[PDB]
Design an enzyme around this catalytic site. Structure first.
Site, PDB file in Angstrom:
ATOM      1  N   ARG A  20       0.804  -1.225   0.000  1.00  0.00           N
ATOM      2  CA  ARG A  20       0.000   0.000   0.000  1.00  0.00           C
ATOM      3  C   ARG A  20       0.837   1.277   0.000  1.00  0.00           C
ATOM      4  NH1 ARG A  20      -3.849  -0.633   4.880  1.00  0.00           N
ATOM      5  NH2 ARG A  20      -2.594  -2.536   5.386  1.00  0.00           N
ATOM      6  N   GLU A  37       4.345 -14.915  -3.528  1.00  0.00           N
ATOM      7  CA  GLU A  37       2.989 -15.262  -3.984  1.00  0.00           C
ATOM      8  C   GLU A  37       3.056 -16.391  -5.016  1.00  0.00           C
ATOM      9  OE1 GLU A  37       0.166 -11.812  -4.649  1.00  0.00           O
ATOM     10  OE2 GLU A  37       2.056 -10.692  -4.742  1.00  0.00           O
TER      11      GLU A  37
END
Ligand code: HEM
Ligand code: HEM
Ligand SMILES: Cc1cc(N)nc(COC[C@H]2C[C@H](OCc3cc(C)cc(N)n3)CN2)c1
Ligand SMILES: Cc1cc(N)nc(COC[C@H]2C[C@H](OCc3cc(C)cc(N)n3)CN2)c1
Ligand SMILES: C[C@H](O)[C@H](O)[C@H]1CNc2nc(N)[nH]c(=O)c2N1
Ligand SMILES: C[C@H](O)[C@H](O)[C@H]1CNc2nc(N)[nH]c(=O)c2N1
Ligand SMILES: [Zn+2]
Lengths: 411, 407
Positions: B109, B283
């Site tokens: 973020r 990921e």
């Protein structure tokens, strides 16, 4: 109400009803989750309900609920409370209470073992010298020449809060830390403050990297006293690597017996402020946290240096590479010396089996995912993929503030 | 009511006040923490609009101005009359950036204010949706120099005219249940693949088949489109030291692009809002490659390395894990496709938390999701206390459309 948890690897769904028996608070609300926050003198008033709830649970576990023996015990405890303002546990209830505090410890991955806990009753102890003797016996028994056995030693309960029994050490066996004038630390940085107190109290510090700390023991609210655990009772493992022969030359070792001595045991509203308990290590506790935390021994650099890994960018994963090697070394060393240890794959697999069994026989297993998931290789262990429900059951182990922050010095 | 979060590695304490703004519920109670559970009218709408416009006008230092009041009035009038309202472009952009800002599970973020917003509220058909999506894919991919983007389709009306992308991500690989008994390709997508086949798709039945887009305009039956192969940047996976690694035949795509979530801004609901960033290495290398219910390649890799797979305590899984993840990062880097490692991303996130505490009074963060799936405690986020709470604008989960759609 029923609550479901899912494992996202296996699609196995479990149903929790045990959470209905929880009364103590979590820190969380409907508007905030405090799941990653480390930390989110009783009157008669509060004491008999707590005693009654405990004795109901105990008598149910023994299939004697509502019996004359159950009713007589409730009456006996009630009279003892109103008359003396407290009560004493029977040995059986003490044993049951201590096993259940472990069974209920939601941060503990090792709970499959909960019903095998040797309970040492030290409620007849009166002096710090008495405490030292009990603790030596606990250490010797638990260590069992490398074939570790879980144990807990239980000192007298709190009375007025001015006569507390306390072990000032956070663990029975831990290494000293010394802040140097140049700002560096020798030994374990986690134990600097306690080490400074020991020195103040008169401990002659060897000032090396792995000095076993003395016990600092408080009996009956008196000023604490220093004792050295006999070195022959302190089992240690030199750390070497199966393929890297330079690993031994790092000079690393660790102790075999993980023994928490600063928590409070609550059973039936009674407070046992000195209740050292021990098990055996999961390898990552030493190899990941003790050795590789930046605020602990912090050996990642030196290990990666010796491995000639590319240290110029984090994206070489040099830290991750050194991390696995150190943890192989810890497990190899302990196994080679025949000292009990468990790897994080074995321990998490066992915990999942424990948790499913508990759901079946008990209606639940409170578990704190933040703590249960190991600090390396998280998602290749089954616990990462397991939804858990965290709630607080009693009997329980609780944090308590360090005693140097609260103690009234006699002088 | 004012809450402290402590970092246990650095002793730095931050004070959270932002949580008091929090509107929605966590799933937790005083009796039970659900921190590890994956998913716990006209009258309703004006409060939500007001709350949002107040924060917007506050952000442009125009709180309590005539322009602020006038807009509140205008939206109020519009809701009274139409039962809904339309966001200004400025509000749309603000809301979308803030939905990312508020995403408590997102470690990336620090980037939140550099989001390219593509306004597709003028879209009417699935072919138009396909066009918008291809343009998003090409813009975001940017020949390997990835740029964050979101494409926002028309907002929900009566809920029988929803725009949806049926895909969970714009780009994913097909999964095929085999007569054999095993799974070819990605087992996560077996069901969606079947649905594509059932709606007409011609599956090549390979290991790494890019799925077609299944697009739903205006509550209509969804339609199939193949993303031009040339717009899907893929990376073959090799290892900087293990020559045999390439023989595994592994590849992954460059663009992580979530397409099944719902964007809520000022009470309006954007049920089709595909958004994309760039990957953090774990990921792919930890989750996509090594989850047992995913490509599950640990065993094969460990064998090629000739490790002792006899005992869990040799940590063979752990050793193979690191190597797989070194290879993923090395491959993306070598092909100049943006990727971030977990050390870098988590360090960035701690800096972002500090920024947000300083400038906003906090940052909602879900520790369970933020801490990477490997090497947890050697990243700084492990030692960081985090408070989790829900702020709007938000991205929310919504159920898969096939369990809902009336054909
Ligand atoms: C038998 C072998 C055992 C293993 C492998 C084990 C494993 C662990 C581990 C890995 C943790 C987290 C430790 C940390 O990260 O600091 C833990 C926490 C804990 N375990 Fe165990 N455990 C064992 C036995 C016991 C015993 C005998 C008790 C008490 C009777 C106990 C009660 C606890 C408690 C209360 C915690 C939470 C500590 C805290 O909050 O700081 N465990 N366990
Ligand atoms: C720019 C690079 C970005 C990075 C490195 C990044 C990193 C991540 C990672 C690692 C996750 C966890 C994903 C998972 O475990 O499945 C995540 C979750 C998420 N991120 Fe990001 N992010 C990025 C951009 C974005 C953007 C552009 C948005 C929205 C505009 C976004 C919103 C989210 C949301 C909503 C989640 C949670 C998804 C869910 O609940 O399944 N992120 N982020
Ligand atoms: C019995 C046992 C077996 C085993 N394998 N490992 C252990 C380790 O438990 C050690 C204990 C001491 C540290 O306590 C830190 C801590 C700090 C604070 C503020 C609260 C809290 N609950 N715990 C972390 N856990 C204990
Ligand atoms: C935007 C973005 C950037 C980046 N580097 N990575 C991502 C990955 O997000 C993928 C999305 C799709 C999966 O969905 C899992 C999931 C399942 C359920 C039932 C609920 C939920 N919230 N999330 C995991 N997160 C997204
Ligand atoms: C802030 C965070 O809760 C803290 O670092 C926790 C995370 N998980 C943990 N898990 C274990 N087993 N032990 C720990 O000390 C911690 N520390
Ligand atoms: C059950 C548990 O909540 C689940 O496995 C979570 C844990 N943390 C995660 N963290 C991220 N980033 N992504 C995930 O899919 C998950 N899965
Ligand atoms: Zn919670």
């Amino acid at each position: 109400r029923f609550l479901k948890v899912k494992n996202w690897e296996t699609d196995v769904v479990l149903t929790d009803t045990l959470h209905l028996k929880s009364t103590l608070e979590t820190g969380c609300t409907e508007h905030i989750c405090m799941g990653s926050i480390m930390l989110p003198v009783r009157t008669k008033d509060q004491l008999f309900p707590l005693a009654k709830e405990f004795l109901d649970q105990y008598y149910s576990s023994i299939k004697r609920f509502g019996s004359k023996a159950h009713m007589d015990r409730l009456e006996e405890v009630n009279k003892e409370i109103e008359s003396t303002s407290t009560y004493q546990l029977k040995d059986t209830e003490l044993i049951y209470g201590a096993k259940h505090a472990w069974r209920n410890a939601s941060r503990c991955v090792g709970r499959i073992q909960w019903s095998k806990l040797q309970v040492f009753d030290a409620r007849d102890c009166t002096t710090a010298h008495g405490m030292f003797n009990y603790i030596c016996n606990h250490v010797k028994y638990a260590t069992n020449k490398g074939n570790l056995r879980s144990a807990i030693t239980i000192f007298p309960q709190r009375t007025d809060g001015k006569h507390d029994f306390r072990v000032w050490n956070s663990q029975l066996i831990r290494y000293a830390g010394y802040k140097q004038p140049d700002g560096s630390t020798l030994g374990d940085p986690a134990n600097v403050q306690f080490t400074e107190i020991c020195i103040q109290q008169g401990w002659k510090a060897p000032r090396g990297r792995f000095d076993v700390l003395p016990l600092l023991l408080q009996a009956n609210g008196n000023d604490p006293e220093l004792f050295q655990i006999p070195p022959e009772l302190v089992l240690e493992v030199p750390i070497r690597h199966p393929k890297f022969d330079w690993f031994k030359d790092l000079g690393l070792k660790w102790y075999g017996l993980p023994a928490v001595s600063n928590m409070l045991l609550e059973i039936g509203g009674l407070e046992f402020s000195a209740c050292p308990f021990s098990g055996w290590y999961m390898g990552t506790e030493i190899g990941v946290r003790d050795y590789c935390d930046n605020s602990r021994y912090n050996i990642l650099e030196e290990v990666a240096k010796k491995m000639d890994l590319d240290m110029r960018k984090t994206s070489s994963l040099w830290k991750d590479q050194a991390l696995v090697e150190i943890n192989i070394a810890v497990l190899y060393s302990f196994q080679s010396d025949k000292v009990t240890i468990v790897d994080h794959h074995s321990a998490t697999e066992s915990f999942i089996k424990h948790m499913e069994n508990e759901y079946r026989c008990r209606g639940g297993c409170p578990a704190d995912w933040v703590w249960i998931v190991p600090p390396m290789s998280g998602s290749i262990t089954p616990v990462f993929h397991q939804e858990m429900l965290n709630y607080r059951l009693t009997p329980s182990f609780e944090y308590q503030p360090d005693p140097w922050n609260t103690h009234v010095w006699k002088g």
